[PDB]
Amino acid sequence: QISAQQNQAAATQKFDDMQAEVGQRGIVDQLRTLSAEGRAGEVNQILAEQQLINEGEIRKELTGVQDAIQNRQYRAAGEQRAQAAANRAAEAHSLSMAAGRENL
Amino acid sequence: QISAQQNQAAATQKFDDMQAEVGQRGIVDQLRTLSAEGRAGEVNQILAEQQLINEGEIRKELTGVQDAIQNRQYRAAGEQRAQAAANRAAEAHSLSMAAGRENL
């Protein structure tokens, strides 16, 4: 009797969790839409009041998304700096070559 | 009889652990909320008094979050420093080029 009662209690908990995920599928959708536009302050505030979401691992996925955005921006800035540095190097070398040729 | 009682004891322990996990979700939620805001001193204090949560691997996740925050701040500072360095280099090169051209 006790073994059967334990088994069915566990099954009931599993079913409740599954139903909770199914019902929560909308908030996760809204958070996914919001976090891909850069807005990161309006995702950490909905994940603090409308919490008890079944899986608390979505946080890591959204953080990864925002980190990817920041990394992309930094990479673009770095490339922009590099090309200008190359142009400056080319100009300086041309002047130096002219001067050296005249001296020789 | 010995085998049956051993199996029953193991099953009872599993059931008790599952129930304890179910009952502790509120504390884990509060910890996630606190640790997502940078406060890393209260998380440890809570995890010192109530220390006995059914899974002691939450600490790894929370430390990962804290490390992510610190890394983001450091990367932003580094980007700012690189931008300032490039701005300095541009002016230095312009002045040097002007002087060299006049000398030639």
Side-chain angles (χ1 to χ4, degrees), chain B residues 10-75:
Chain B
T12 298
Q13 197 70 15
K14 262 171 45 53
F15 181 72
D16 280 7
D17 288 349
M18 169 217 97
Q19 204 140 300
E21 250 207 320
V22 157
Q24 281 172 351
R25 289 160 144 151
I27 314 298
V28 173
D29 218 45
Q30 186 176 348
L31 287 167
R32 272 188 241 264
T33 298
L34 274 163
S35 166
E37 288 189 350
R39 310 217 276 249
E42 327 202 15
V43 56
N44 273 50
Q45 179 134 359
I46 275 176
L47 272 181
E49 312 141 23
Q50 291 226 56
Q51 198 41 89
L52 255 172
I53 315 201
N54 201 82
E55 299 262 30
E57 87 189 339
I58 291 141
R59 289 169 162 284
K60 156 178 288 285
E61 146 181 349
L62 305 182
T63 55
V65 172
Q66 183 184 20
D67 285 11
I69 298 304
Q70 211 80 350
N71 286 7
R72 251 205 299 273
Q73 175 177 324
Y74 290 167
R75 292 218 54 204

